[PDB]
Design a protein that fits this description.
part of a larger assembly; 4 chains; A mainly beta (112); B mainly alpha (138); C mainly beta (109); D mainly alpha (50); B: 138 residues; mainly alpha; 6 helices; C: 109 residues; mainly beta; six-stranded antiparallel β-barrel; 39% strand; globular; membrane protein; mitochondria
């Protein structure tokens, strides 16, 4: 299906507000912006609502070179991370992405 | 562009006037009472004009996207179908940055109109497709 | 027969607490009373009134199904204080303060 | 010598606790003033934009 899209409103530190036209997702839903604009991937979980048609959300990577009109995309789920025996003997980031430069983690399912 | 009849109402005081109802809220109570003032005084109780204007603005918004704040309300080919006072108040909302409170303005203006006309509304949701018999029952 | 009374929509939520925005003006909520929030067509999130404001907004304490709350959800009102079941049938049990029994391994007060 | 060695530490922790309790009362008062600033509303600021 089509993915929901929202637009940044204000930035104060790592905290960001986003205006969702149709409706706002639940709290803890993750929201991803492509690395074309910011330069790096950036997933951002909702933590609280301010009013209708607005959501406050924390960033994981740095907010450097972040603008006030960037398209944000609703993933439709919380921050999912891999699980299984493929996660054994591996170093992981906050996002669940492996950083030990070895290879792609051979997960089967991801849990929030 | 704004007429002096509107500028007199804007620069003057209007919130202290007598209304059909005392209205709870922050700034949008004034966004609604000012619409009621225009519709009652200069437009001569043509309330439905602004209620149609809201619909027109919604249809324009959907086609133009969310960033309609940056464009000016008066000079625009899309907004030509709106009323001058409605445009004035959208300019005022743009000045105060309260453009995210528009739904909370229309939900109040509709109450003001429905209490001036004394027409309480009721909302029904029936079906994936309407059924006359169930409606007659309802 | 039994029509639930609505007072507003969910305006904001900050973790354990929430702020309601009332729909109409002539509607009036009591103080310290329980409210309900239709988080879904099936379930209901109980609540309680702790503040009232000049803007008509309502400061609300939430008690159940906080994760299922959103912005724009219909907000209902019981118009009664918070009550719980009481009696000798409750002795020998662990119990949620909402009256719900916690498994292990009529009257209202 | 021992009594002096204890007396300087006692005076030091006494002044430490004094200064921390003063800072604490100050940050309480500033927290309350800030909460009241949040409680107070913003006005309208209506003026000619044209």
């Amino acid at each position: 299906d089509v993915k929901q899209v929202g637009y940044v409103q204000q930035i104060i530190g790592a905290v960001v507000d986003v205006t969702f036209t149709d409706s706002v997702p639940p709290v803890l839903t993750a929201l991803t912006v492509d690395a074309k604009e910011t330069g790096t991937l950036l997933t951002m979980e909702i933590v609280q609502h301010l009013d209708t048609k607005t959501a406050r959300c924390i960033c994981m990577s740095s907010t450097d070179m972040l603008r006030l009109r960037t398209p944000v995309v609703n993933t439709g789920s919380q921050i999912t991370v891999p699980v299984g025996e493929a996660t054994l003997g591996r170093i992981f980031n906050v996002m669940g992405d492996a950083i030990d430069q070895r290879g792609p983690v051979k997960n089967k399912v991801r849990w929030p | 562009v704004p007429s002096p009849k509107y500028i007199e109402i804007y620069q003057s005081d209007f919130s202290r006037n007598a209304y059909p109802l005392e209205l709870l809220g922050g700034s949008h109570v004034d966004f609604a009472k000012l619409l009621y003032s225009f519709a009652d005084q200069v437009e001569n109780k043509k309330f439905e004009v602004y209620v149609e204007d809201f619909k027109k603005l919604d249809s324009i918004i959907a086609e133009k996207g969310p960033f309609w704040a940056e464009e000016k309300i008066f000079q625009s080919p899309t907004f030509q179908g709106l009323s001058e006072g409605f445009k004035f108040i959208l300019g005022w909302i743009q000045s105060e940055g309260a453009i995210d409170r528009l739904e909370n303005v229309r939900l109040a203006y509709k109450e003001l109109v429905n209490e001036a006309r004394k027409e309480t509304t009721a909302t029904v949701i029936v079906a994936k497709e309407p059924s006359g018999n169930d409606l007659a029952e309802i | 027969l039994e029509a639930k009374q609505k007072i507003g929509f969910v305006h904001g939520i900050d973790g354990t607490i929430a702020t309601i925005a009332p729909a109409a003006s002539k509607v009036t909520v009591p103080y310290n009373t329980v409210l309900e929030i239709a988080v879904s067509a099936t379930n209901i999130a109980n609540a309680l009134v702790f503040n009232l404001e000049k803007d008509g907004s309502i400061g609300v304490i939430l008690l159940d199904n906080i994760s299922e709350v959103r912005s724009g959800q219909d907000v209902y009102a019981t118009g009664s204080l918070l009550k719980i079941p009481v009696g000798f049938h409750m002795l020998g049990k662990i119990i949620n303060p909402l009256g719900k029994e916690i498994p292990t391994g009529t009257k209202l007060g | 010598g021992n009594i002096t060695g204890l007396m300087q530490l006692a005076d030091y922790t006494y002044n430490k606790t004094r200064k921390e309790l003063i800072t604490a009362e100050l940050l309480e008062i500033i927290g309350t003033m800030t909460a009241m600033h949040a409680g107070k509303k913003v006005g309208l600021k209506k003026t000619e934009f044209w």
